[PDB]
Amino acid sequence: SVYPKALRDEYIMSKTLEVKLAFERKTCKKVAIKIISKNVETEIEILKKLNHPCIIKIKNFFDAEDYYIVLELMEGGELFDKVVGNKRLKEATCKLYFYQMLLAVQYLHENGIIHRDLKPENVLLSSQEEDCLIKITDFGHSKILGETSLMRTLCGTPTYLAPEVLVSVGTAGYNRAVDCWSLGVILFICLSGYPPFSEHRTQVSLKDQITSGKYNFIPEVWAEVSEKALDLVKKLLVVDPKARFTTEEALRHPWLQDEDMKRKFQDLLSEENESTALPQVL
Amino acid sequence: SVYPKALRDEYIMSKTLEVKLAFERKTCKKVAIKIISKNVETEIEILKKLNHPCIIKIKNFFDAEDYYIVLELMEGGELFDKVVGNKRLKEATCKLYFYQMLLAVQYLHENGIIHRDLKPENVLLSSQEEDCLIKITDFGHSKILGETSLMRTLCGTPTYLAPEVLVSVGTAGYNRAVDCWSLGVILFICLSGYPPFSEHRTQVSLKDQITSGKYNFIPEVWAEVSEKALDLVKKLLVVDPKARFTTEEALRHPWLQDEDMKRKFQDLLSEENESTALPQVL
Ligand SMILES: Cc1n[nH]c(N)c1-c1cccs1
Ligand SMILES: Cc1n[nH]c(N)c1-c1cccs1
Ligand SMILES: [Cl-]
Ligand SMILES: [Cl-]
């Protein structure tokens, strides 16, 4: 194969990062082209509507023999590459990155979007520096919250309504809580260098470990981590979704009540913004 | 307002049955026009694809200032009108009508469609005769079963997967069972002349009655009804959807093992078909 004439007209394609590096011809600036073999409809619609510094932006789109999505290039790569092979980040770097992951997911939920696939491989770092801006990516499994079939059903008389439907009312509207569980698994991995649930050196099934919410706690590893960080992990890795910490609750947790970390994020933010800055009305 | 020029071109509109009576100009045959104020997308797609004698057929469609759906005219009206005001059908008529309702819902499920709104007001009778063909209508709340987000999710490793998601695996794929509950409430109403769950002369909430599956049993009323009929009602009005009778299970129940009723249905079927009948290759 070859790239479509339309893409080629605007971009000079390069090395694989399938995601490839490309140069926008107009600006000579680098971009990332995500190629999907011929759901991408919702993904583009979600991404076009979202506007947050910790959420990846669509720059352009091509629907040809394959789907081509032009995105912001993140030079630091994946968070996965910083946590793989029992490698662990400094507690302060976990805080900085986590704080941004919380802001991004709070924005998503505020905007009626559930990501559904949060992992270290879907978290991108802006630079090769420890202190940097992170961005959430991969909205292919994301879900849009609107008016439910349940809300419509509850309007009528339930003379003919099945009991399982009435039982589901208790839990309805807690889907977003799956993202908070994911964040707790990401935070555990970042702080410890190891996954909370695994089939490595265990008799109990990965399924049974998760439903019981009995994560693997290794004291020697966690002794290096503060009580505050672990308290937040414990609060997100709660089995009952109605009881689990929300992004707002996590954001108010003592561990995130750090003015230093918050200043470093604002600093990185304005450093990135300095290029875009239009003159101000005094 | 007025009717669109496109509808008027083909049909001479009449009296209200909003659903109106109309005459197709080409054939002079009567039709029913369902008017919806400007979901009807799925409804038309579902109805165009379905082909069963106990399911209503779309004859035509108009998307104007309002949605106009041209349907088969059912001269006997709604089943509701035969059961309202404590009126009760003969046990044999219940069997005939129920047998057709089961065939229709079996077809729907076989074809990956869940109706979601089965009631006496959505069951239409073909003629003003007790022994007639019934048809299922109102596919506006209907749902299409395809490949789930759950099936896709189960393919990956659940390292980051929330426990409620793994718990939902146990019940997944039992949505169709809501239609069987509805059928049990319809069968109860038809045989008794009264609803199984109501706020009339009760202290217990309609919600609590349904989730407990504790229907109102009045012995004086049900003494007139056979043990076999009541056994089938009891089997459909089961709270656990995994244990509840399916349409196939209902169809194999002793109450429906009636060759007389089955011959009367085949008789009504061929009487309706006699008009359409193209010569046969001997
Ligand atoms: C999008 C995007 N922007 N910058 C990078 N490295 C990506 C990648 C996503 C997935 C693999 S690489
Ligand atoms: C459709 C249809 N065909 N024949 C009748 N009576 C209808 C009605 C549906 C709802 C009210 S009337
Ligand atoms: Cl090429
Ligand atoms: Cl008119």
From Swiss-Prot, chains A, B:
Gene that this sequence comes from: CHEK2
Listed result of changing residue 117 to A: Loss of kinase activity and of the ability to phosphorylate CDC25A
GO biological process, one term: protein autophosphorylation
Family label: Belongs to the protein kinase superfamily. CAMK Ser/Thr protein kinase family. CHK2 subfamily.
Binding partners and assembly: Homodimer. Homodimerization is part of the activation process but the dimer may dissociate following activation. Interacts with PML. Interacts with TP53. Interacts with RB1; phosphorylates RB1. Interacts with BRCA1. Interacts with CDC25A; phosphorylates CDC25A and mediates its degradation in response to ionizing radiation. Interacts with CUL1; mediates CHEK2 ubiquitination and regulation.
Involvement in disorder: Tumor predisposition syndrome 4: A disorder characterized by an increased risk for developing various types of benign and/or malignant neoplasms that arise at an accelerated rate and in different organs.
EC number: 2.7.11.1
Organism from which the protein derives: Homo sapiens
Highest taxon in the source lineage: Eukaryota
Task of the protein: Serine/threonine-protein kinase which is required for checkpoint-mediated cell cycle arrest, activation of DNA repair and apoptosis in response to the presence of DNA double-strand breaks. May also negatively regulate cell cycle progression during unperturbed cell cycles. Following activation, phosphorylates numerous effectors preferentially at the consensus sequence [L-X-R-X-X-S/T]. Regulates cell cycle checkpoint arrest through phosphorylation of CDC25A, CDC25B and CDC25C, inhibiting their activity. (Microbial infection) Phosphorylates herpes simplex virus 1/HHV-1 protein ICP0 and thus activates its SUMO-targeted ubiquitin ligase activity.
PTM comment text: Phosphorylated. Autophosphorylates at Thr-153 and Thr-157 in the T-loop/activation segment upon dimerization to become fully active and phosphorylate its substrates like for instance CDC25C. DNA damage-induced autophosphorylation at Ser-149 induces CUL1-mediated ubiquitination and regulates the pro-apoptotic function. Phosphorylation at Ser-226 also regulates ubiquitination. Phosphorylated by PLK4.
Chemical reaction(s) catalysed: L-seryl-[protein] + ATP = O-phospho-L-seryl-[protein] + ADP + H(+); L-threonyl-[protein] + ATP = O-phospho-L-threonyl-[protein] + ADP + H(+)
UniProt keyword list: Apoptosis, ATP-binding, Cell cycle, Cell division, Disease variant, DNA damage, DNA repair, Host-virus interaction, Kinase, Li-Fraumeni syndrome, Magnesium, Metal-binding, Mitosis, Nucleotide-binding, Nucleus, Phosphoprotein, Serine/threonine-protein kinase, Transcription, Transcription regulation, Transferase, Tumor suppressor, Ubl conjugation
Record protein name field: Serine/threonine-protein kinase Chk2
Parent-protein residues present: 210 to 512 of 543
